[PDB]
């Protein structure tokens, strides 16, 4: 059936359309009917569910109770693409899917359709509870980092709740508990502000298996306080005190999972979802053409650039700067013009909105709608704003070139017949990439699967001392991947040494986790020897100390998992979004820098 | 008593794949016949009953083995 | 009437939407003036004056219609025809500028910004921050779930391969394809995978035993060997190759 | 090099169903090779549990039947 | 697939199927036409000196590149000279500014690049082209509703499409309206336009509810009043999804932009119950079902009155002839027409003679073969046709 | 072959098929099921 | 001397037949908004009403047909009747009829007058007649109600099917339409911070405002009852037939009574391997009870559920 | 069936400790969840009779920030502890208490002078921990009756005209209710699916039974509308 949103309905549940079950569950129903004694014979049962009156709906509820169903969508790319839920019957023709899982499924609500399947037996039901229910797996068994992460209006609401603002009545009150709900709901106050000092208990995990209460009065805001009612003990207050954007919230469920485990985090998520929606809705967040603010400077920069390029083309009329070099030249002009118009609009939409306590300008971060939307991390990006307010920029000709005259218009002012017709080139060229990308992607995953399936994970330990030496990835333009991110999880081949001679921080082989990675982070160790698969721990299996973290649940991988296929779908799942082929990614000029002179960022 | 999360019963027996085997072998007994639950029924299905008894530490591979040897010896 | 999510609009960069709403707002506004005017039994002359004054607004705009050419009724007619809103028409790339939209909109005593204070309906409380409200012109597409929702439990099969039939209307069951198996394998859930493959598609004796045990409350599988394998073995025997299953 | 490496798998049933079926079956028919059913695709196509996961338990039980006799 | 620079006012760069045939299936642009040789040519205004003459010339793609052509949207004066001395133009595969005296042509209207589909979409500038590209495709797959609302903001194009599409009833040779009604509309034509000796008036029979290929209604409803003058070209009726000669594919709705409790999340959409009460967005659907009665090896087949093994309950909605009364509400496997198929030669032995004696054989070898409604379908019977054979002596209600 | 609607079949149900389906689901013993299968043909 | 103050309904002002205002003068600090909001939701939610429900007309057999010499489709006429607003006295069913002939519009005044039935707009249009010789006759059925009840839902009544030619229409009932309110400072100057609530209603002309307000607050006040005091904190297997009437002759009945078996069910669930061994049964009586109980019940097993006695 | 509406048949109460309570009523007409809940909530926090500390008089330092002779706690925190103190008051609207304590160890609420009208719920609430030395503390706490929550935005600021110095008015929490949150869930009766299950989550400081507080607010709102029900079903 078609998917709609689930905006109550906790994570492990799933709105299943009333009419549609009653079919799926037929055999089950007839069983119950014959037990209660409402039908002596199969034809009787059959007839009453055909007539579908009365007792039958009552028994349907009794049938469905705790019986996990499983939903599946479309291209199934990774194993997350099918998950299992407790249904809740709902009159309707469509299936309600909780928001949080929309990530995994890669599903919006524009007319996507889900299949539903019914586990029978017992074994299957248990495999659905203890494997595919959406509350087992909150972490992506590729990168390891959480999925489930709140998106889109949840983000916008948390980000609105926690802000600072100048003035906004009831500022500098001192209150305790807070609870502070009192005061937002009652008026009395504005949650964006006041920079209210509130007293708070912490409950740190400082002591092993015990929560030590620490309380104090902190300077914070009302909506911070309000939001603190959700956070389940064991975490610091400092996690909720900040602008709290998208990133922030992934990190916050990450820390929660790591510190206090699965059970309180899967609830904690829910709660976050709810308070997000809530508040975001209260905020009244909207969008209006005045929300797109074109900087006054734009006209001036474009005129200056029209004059420069005029100078160079007149030099071409004089014989100088042949069109060969003049092309790259004019590209270098209009692109710098792009960057300057961009910088102007970004400077204008951030900051400003200057409120006044006695000094008339404290110069606060803007509360502009589109700005908040990009800033929150909810929708969109700076680049995407620049299309609405500053220049569109240089257009890519379908042959992989750049047109000399870029589009000077944002979408707030419209495009010209000519410029729109030019935009078209690249639009369609890019639509037609997603086709190709599906086919080639899938063929790739097909082959990867095919090769990798026999891998199993059989023996527990192997005992091989071979391994791979692990370092940072440093290159020009500092380092992209830090050595903790590479060496996390895994396991250690031979030992590690402190920067001092004959000093070991880890024995033998060890599982390396967030704590051990903090040990290695605080010391000067720039290389760590780590054992891994492909060093052929054991025979057929790839034993678990190679390998060594399952991702997903953060413990080490248990014996008997696949690994094969997980890898293949982990590799292959991405690449749906990829540059594909035939791009030079030049950006500036075809001619190389030609400077062999090195440079350093730091000392 | 619907179980949202199995972790508590997974600490009892490592590797959930094992849990599923033990859960269903224990639930089968109550489902088909020739057993009664060790835990008060909350109206829930037999599967959740079984996982609860595993989370309580009353049932496990060893315990089901000892009960099997006891029932075979008593018969 | 209908509430839609701002967060669509920046990422997708379709701003026709927003300008549509605003000019729509301003379009209803004029018809509200005229509605209220005819409903108060105003004279024909004043009504003529406000419609004439409406049509002629904007820079340039090339449409010169004026009244006084058509008289008495004909004007009452049209005004009753536009009671429900004034139909403003913006051609493709010479269309109306924002400036003309705010101008049109000030004639309707609507706020220039096109956003308005709205109140919650449950709590009665004002939303913080104003909100864009506006007439946008919707469509209903030919996709309806009445045509979509399917659901089967046990139906007719295929003579060869003995699997369920393709689609709705014919009651398909629902392809469970190779990627979908891969995902289960990846979970390591082999029973669910094993009842998919067999019992609930091509195992004939096992589908029966399955459904009879379900009706009886057994929930146990008794898996067998799927038809379609047997077929394959005959089709390879049809070349001069034997393939036999050795114990 | 991963397609070469699929087609070269010991089990003639997988890799037959990957790519090239004619070729595969001719190498296998002339050679007289037995499948052993030891991977996941074979088990699927025969319809039995997969040596992984929940069924992994059950493929040890049967494997101990082969070693013990 | 790609847009080539000669598709300028010939095909369209926006309207194209988004599916895996992409750029393959294109749509003619507005003012596009075709030569005797089969080539796409497109109009331009002729510019002599720096004044724009109102003579237009159709240029083919080879003819076009030789010349200089100005821009659709550019300035101009009462005299016809360009305001700005440097005018953005096209030459050959390119575009750039040229002097006033260089350019000999001009684009006519701004609609040239865009196809009719997209020529309908307001504010199409502000839209990205791909996203414009969807919406152009989506206005096709809309579905006409019970009452047609004129779009409140629009391009101007709607009159053409409506009346060109030929779904409206348009008045030829017009005059005052003699008689009006739902299904019929006659015009008493002016004495001026008439063929001598024919005299008389013009009649128009409107089409009431009629399946469409996509099983949707086609319905014409008269615009004109009575005793009203009509000229040639004025619309007498509106087809479906038409209001007074405009193309009205959807409804206007008062929209508010703001997140509301997660109900509008992702790309979903929350609606007031008002809308559902007031029945905008309610759409009709007419579905055809046919019964045919034919000659087998075992002899002819007859339709109804009466059937074996069938209750009076089921037969209550049928007629003397066996077809359902026009007007019946039919659900589920109610019998729409009944029909009998004879079997082979049942003769003798006491049991056969006994069943024939007790029940009068109940037409004996005939079977139950009838036109029952498909399960899970519903609706009243709006019309029945019943085409017969010559010399069958049909009688009954045929 | 496959991927098309070849005339593979419908597998319809006659009366004997349906009666046998009805026997499958009723509490017959091992023998009584043999008599039942003996009668439905 | 805190106490409170109770508002009073005063200064109802009637702008038109539809539009009205009602003002509640003496309200405290936060009661404005309280009662304003509540009242609004009770007003728009529920309020009683009289809507057309069934229309049957001489021409036309279903809704998609057209009548000769009316301009409209019968659909459109249904929708115009939809919109007809009318009040009535005690009688909830109220069938009414209208006839007419000749050229011109058919308004609501054409409805044959009834004592207790009162049309609020006589000028409301229904159809038209294009020429003489055409008539309309129809019988409209107007009943009282509360929410929005569609035609499609209300057919659950089932029983005898309504005859052909009876058109059913969606009933919208509640007249209240739109409702606003605002609260504003009171002028009494006896005590400042007193404010007052005005409510603006627009209805179809059916409801008087004071009765509207009145009802609303009665509904609300009756709705708070359990808040005033918070307190505290069949299906059977179809057959009890004594085994005596099954005609077991002599032996089988007594062998069934030896196990202290009453009625059926307690007997019906046993495996023949369990029953086969008791004294006096033998192989014959088992087939005897197999034949007797083969009829009717057929069962000879289930796990069932429980027992009433 | 007109004018006949549903009443809740469940009205269940489930409580944590003494002062936290969660009541569910089911069913309700669709739309009534929000209605009744929002009204009750609105009332509880806006308006409700109670009494709190509206001023405190401390010896020595009259500034809002000071050393306060080494109490170890800034007087912001003392005033804040005095804000969450629960007090019962008789007929008389205004009453002032005094407390004097010396020695070592925390200052509880038991050291306050005992009067017949004033009733303290728990001594457990601590005003200050003072400091270890020979040192004392003397202060006059002030309580009066009130309604709602009146901050130090006004609280009769008196415009600096106060004769006997002191002051430093404290935000006074009158309405004895701490958190109220309602919530609205699907209920079903027979085949009708859309109904309302209202949930009230209510946490109170003390001095009043939560459920009985609910009761009270209902009587206030009911008492407002009693003007209007006089026409329909008055008796």
PDB file of C-alpha atoms in Angstrom, chain G residues 171-301:
ATOM      1  CA  UNK G 171     -25.951  15.640   5.528  1.00  0.00           C
ATOM      2  CA  UNK G 172     -23.903  18.439   7.046  1.00  0.00           C
ATOM      3  CA  UNK G 173     -26.154  19.268  10.111  1.00  0.00           C
ATOM      4  CA  UNK G 174     -24.340  21.838  12.370  1.00  0.00           C
ATOM      5  CA  UNK G 175     -25.138  25.403  11.401  1.00  0.00           C
ATOM      6  CA  UNK G 176     -22.442  27.168  13.218  1.00  0.00           C
ATOM      7  CA  UNK G 177     -20.015  27.940  10.133  1.00  0.00           C
ATOM      8  CA  UNK G 178     -17.396  30.432  11.346  1.00  0.00           C
ATOM      9  CA  UNK G 179     -16.619  31.552  14.867  1.00  0.00           C
ATOM     10  CA  UNK G 180     -14.226  34.089  16.265  1.00  0.00           C
ATOM     11  CA  UNK G 181     -13.668  35.826  19.467  1.00  0.00           C
ATOM     12  CA  UNK G 182     -11.458  38.250  21.192  1.00  0.00           C
ATOM     13  CA  UNK G 183     -10.990  39.536  24.566  1.00  0.00           C
ATOM     14  CA  UNK G 184     -10.544  43.184  25.387  1.00  0.00           C
ATOM     15  CA  UNK G 185     -10.302  45.363  28.473  1.00  0.00           C
ATOM     16  CA  UNK G 186     -13.415  46.024  30.538  1.00  0.00           C
ATOM     17  CA  UNK G 187     -14.543  49.593  31.149  1.00  0.00           C
ATOM     18  CA  UNK G 188     -16.060  49.082  34.620  1.00  0.00           C
ATOM     19  CA  UNK G 189     -13.135  50.866  36.329  1.00  0.00           C
ATOM     20  CA  UNK G 190     -14.422  49.479  39.645  1.00  0.00           C
ATOM     21  CA  UNK G 191     -11.520  47.018  39.359  1.00  0.00           C
ATOM     22  CA  UNK G 192      -8.908  47.127  36.614  1.00  0.00           C
ATOM     23  CA  UNK G 193      -7.621  43.867  34.967  1.00  0.00           C
ATOM     24  CA  UNK G 194     -11.214  42.815  34.473  1.00  0.00           C
ATOM     25  CA  UNK G 195     -11.675  42.106  30.747  1.00  0.00           C
ATOM     26  CA  UNK G 196     -14.568  40.954  28.453  1.00  0.00           C
ATOM     27  CA  UNK G 197     -15.065  38.398  25.755  1.00  0.00           C
ATOM     28  CA  UNK G 198     -16.889  39.063  22.585  1.00  0.00           C
ATOM     29  CA  UNK G 199     -17.818  36.241  20.218  1.00  0.00           C
ATOM     30  CA  UNK G 200     -18.645  36.783  16.640  1.00  0.00           C
ATOM     31  CA  UNK G 201     -20.849  33.999  15.110  1.00  0.00           C
ATOM     32  CA  UNK G 202     -22.001  33.479  11.555  1.00  0.00           C
ATOM     33  CA  UNK G 203     -24.661  30.736  10.992  1.00  0.00           C
ATOM     34  CA  UNK G 204     -27.126  29.770   8.372  1.00  0.00           C
ATOM     35  CA  UNK G 205     -30.058  31.452  10.314  1.00  0.00           C
ATOM     36  CA  UNK G 206     -31.129  28.283  12.101  1.00  0.00           C
ATOM     37  CA  UNK G 207     -29.728  28.861  15.524  1.00  0.00           C
ATOM     38  CA  UNK G 208     -30.329  31.886  17.773  1.00  0.00           C
ATOM     39  CA  UNK G 209     -27.204  33.039  19.396  1.00  0.00           C
ATOM     40  CA  UNK G 210     -28.261  32.931  22.963  1.00  0.00           C
ATOM     41  CA  UNK G 211     -29.391  29.314  22.494  1.00  0.00           C
ATOM     42  CA  UNK G 212     -26.095  28.564  20.744  1.00  0.00           C
ATOM     43  CA  UNK G 213     -23.972  29.905  23.564  1.00  0.00           C
ATOM     44  CA  UNK G 214     -26.193  28.534  26.050  1.00  0.00           C
ATOM     45  CA  UNK G 215     -25.978  25.016  24.617  1.00  0.00           C
ATOM     46  CA  UNK G 216     -22.376  25.145  24.193  1.00  0.00           C
ATOM     47  CA  UNK G 217     -21.711  25.907  27.809  1.00  0.00           C
ATOM     48  CA  UNK G 218     -24.175  23.331  28.978  1.00  0.00           C
ATOM     49  CA  UNK G 219     -22.361  20.721  26.906  1.00  0.00           C
ATOM     50  CA  UNK G 220     -19.061  21.834  28.406  1.00  0.00           C
ATOM     51  CA  UNK G 221     -20.243  22.027  31.879  1.00  0.00           C
ATOM     52  CA  UNK G 222     -21.850  18.603  31.654  1.00  0.00           C
ATOM     53  CA  UNK G 223     -18.638  17.376  30.223  1.00  0.00           C
ATOM     54  CA  UNK G 224     -16.878  18.182  33.485  1.00  0.00           C
ATOM     55  CA  UNK G 225     -18.317  15.778  35.864  1.00  0.00           C
ATOM     56  CA  UNK G 226     -15.694  13.092  36.401  1.00  0.00           C
ATOM     57  CA  UNK G 227     -13.217  15.864  36.874  1.00  0.00           C
ATOM     58  CA  UNK G 228     -15.381  17.128  39.760  1.00  0.00           C
ATOM     59  CA  UNK G 229     -15.042  13.721  41.435  1.00  0.00           C
ATOM     60  CA  UNK G 230     -12.252  11.315  40.452  1.00  0.00           C
ATOM     61  CA  UNK G 231     -13.107   7.837  41.721  1.00  0.00           C
ATOM     62  CA  UNK G 232     -12.064   4.123  41.692  1.00  0.00           C
ATOM     63  CA  UNK G 233      -8.503   3.512  40.420  1.00  0.00           C
ATOM     64  CA  UNK G 234     -21.638 -13.074  25.324  1.00  0.00           C
ATOM     65  CA  UNK G 235     -19.186 -15.485  23.679  1.00  0.00           C
ATOM     66  CA  UNK G 236     -19.802 -19.183  24.334  1.00  0.00           C
ATOM     67  CA  UNK G 237     -19.577 -22.321  22.177  1.00  0.00           C
ATOM     68  CA  UNK G 238     -23.190 -22.379  20.828  1.00  0.00           C
ATOM     69  CA  UNK G 239     -24.137 -25.831  22.198  1.00  0.00           C
ATOM     70  CA  UNK G 240     -25.191 -27.233  25.482  1.00  0.00           C
ATOM     71  CA  UNK G 241     -27.237 -30.244  24.473  1.00  0.00           C
ATOM     72  CA  UNK G 242     -27.543 -33.167  26.935  1.00  0.00           C
ATOM     73  CA  UNK G 243     -26.144 -36.417  25.527  1.00  0.00           C
ATOM     74  CA  UNK G 244     -29.462 -38.144  26.309  1.00  0.00           C
ATOM     75  CA  UNK G 245     -31.301 -36.863  23.211  1.00  0.00           C
ATOM     76  CA  UNK G 246     -28.602 -38.006  20.769  1.00  0.00           C
ATOM     77  CA  UNK G 247     -30.146 -41.522  20.953  1.00  0.00           C
ATOM     78  CA  UNK G 248     -27.202 -43.638  22.114  1.00  0.00           C
ATOM     79  CA  UNK G 249     -29.558 -46.576  22.800  1.00  0.00           C
ATOM     80  CA  UNK G 250     -28.452 -48.258  26.023  1.00  0.00           C
ATOM     81  CA  UNK G 251     -24.748 -49.049  26.345  1.00  0.00           C
ATOM     82  CA  UNK G 252     -23.100 -45.960  24.855  1.00  0.00           C
ATOM     83  CA  UNK G 253     -25.090 -43.466  26.945  1.00  0.00           C
ATOM     84  CA  UNK G 254     -24.209 -45.248  30.188  1.00  0.00           C
ATOM     85  CA  UNK G 255     -20.557 -45.573  29.149  1.00  0.00           C
ATOM     86  CA  UNK G 256     -20.540 -41.810  28.553  1.00  0.00           C
ATOM     87  CA  UNK G 257     -22.219 -41.224  31.931  1.00  0.00           C
ATOM     88  CA  UNK G 258     -19.625 -43.414  33.690  1.00  0.00           C
ATOM     89  CA  UNK G 259     -16.999 -40.727  33.015  1.00  0.00           C
ATOM     90  CA  UNK G 260     -19.450 -38.197  34.541  1.00  0.00           C
ATOM     91  CA  UNK G 261     -19.931 -36.530  31.178  1.00  0.00           C
ATOM     92  CA  UNK G 262     -22.689 -33.945  30.795  1.00  0.00           C
ATOM     93  CA  UNK G 263     -23.875 -32.348  27.540  1.00  0.00           C
ATOM     94  CA  UNK G 264     -21.482 -32.357  24.571  1.00  0.00           C
ATOM     95  CA  UNK G 265     -18.255 -30.411  24.729  1.00  0.00           C
ATOM     96  CA  UNK G 266     -16.602 -32.190  27.638  1.00  0.00           C
ATOM     97  CA  UNK G 267     -17.245 -35.378  25.582  1.00  0.00           C
ATOM     98  CA  UNK G 268     -16.333 -33.925  22.214  1.00  0.00           C
ATOM     99  CA  UNK G 269     -12.667 -33.330  22.980  1.00  0.00           C
ATOM    100  CA  UNK G 270     -10.932 -36.684  23.471  1.00  0.00           C
ATOM    101  CA  UNK G 271      -8.689 -38.673  21.151  1.00  0.00           C
ATOM    102  CA  UNK G 272     -10.059 -42.055  20.140  1.00  0.00           C
ATOM    103  CA  UNK G 273      -6.837 -43.564  21.553  1.00  0.00           C
ATOM    104  CA  UNK G 274      -7.756 -42.049  24.928  1.00  0.00           C
ATOM    105  CA  UNK G 275     -11.421 -43.124  24.799  1.00  0.00           C
ATOM    106  CA  UNK G 276     -10.795 -46.606  23.422  1.00  0.00           C
ATOM    107  CA  UNK G 277      -9.673 -47.980  26.780  1.00  0.00           C
ATOM    108  CA  UNK G 278     -12.370 -47.885  29.477  1.00  0.00           C
ATOM    109  CA  UNK G 279     -14.559 -50.852  30.516  1.00  0.00           C
ATOM    110  CA  UNK G 280     -17.565 -51.884  28.399  1.00  0.00           C
ATOM    111  CA  UNK G 281     -16.975 -49.644  25.332  1.00  0.00           C
ATOM    112  CA  UNK G 282     -15.363 -52.116  22.933  1.00  0.00           C
ATOM    113  CA  UNK G 283     -14.771 -51.338  19.265  1.00  0.00           C
ATOM    114  CA  UNK G 284     -18.490 -51.284  18.417  1.00  0.00           C
ATOM    115  CA  UNK G 285     -19.685 -48.500  20.720  1.00  0.00           C
ATOM    116  CA  UNK G 286     -16.845 -46.236  19.582  1.00  0.00           C
ATOM    117  CA  UNK G 287     -18.056 -46.490  15.995  1.00  0.00           C
ATOM    118  CA  UNK G 288     -21.611 -46.074  17.314  1.00  0.00           C
ATOM    119  CA  UNK G 289     -20.822 -42.738  18.955  1.00  0.00           C
ATOM    120  CA  UNK G 290     -18.748 -41.977  15.855  1.00  0.00           C
ATOM    121  CA  UNK G 291     -21.901 -42.393  13.755  1.00  0.00           C
ATOM    122  CA  UNK G 292     -24.258 -40.555  16.087  1.00  0.00           C
ATOM    123  CA  UNK G 293     -21.904 -37.661  16.682  1.00  0.00           C
ATOM    124  CA  UNK G 294     -20.796 -37.815  13.037  1.00  0.00           C
ATOM    125  CA  UNK G 295     -24.047 -35.966  12.387  1.00  0.00           C
ATOM    126  CA  UNK G 296     -24.561 -32.442  13.824  1.00  0.00           C
ATOM    127  CA  UNK G 297     -21.237 -31.543  15.658  1.00  0.00           C
ATOM    128  CA  UNK G 298     -18.921 -33.700  13.567  1.00  0.00           C
ATOM    129  CA  UNK G 299     -16.121 -32.649  15.852  1.00  0.00           C
ATOM    130  CA  UNK G 300     -14.620 -35.379  18.064  1.00  0.00           C
ATOM    131  CA  UNK G 301     -11.970 -32.840  19.066  1.00  0.00           C
TER     132      UNK G 301
END
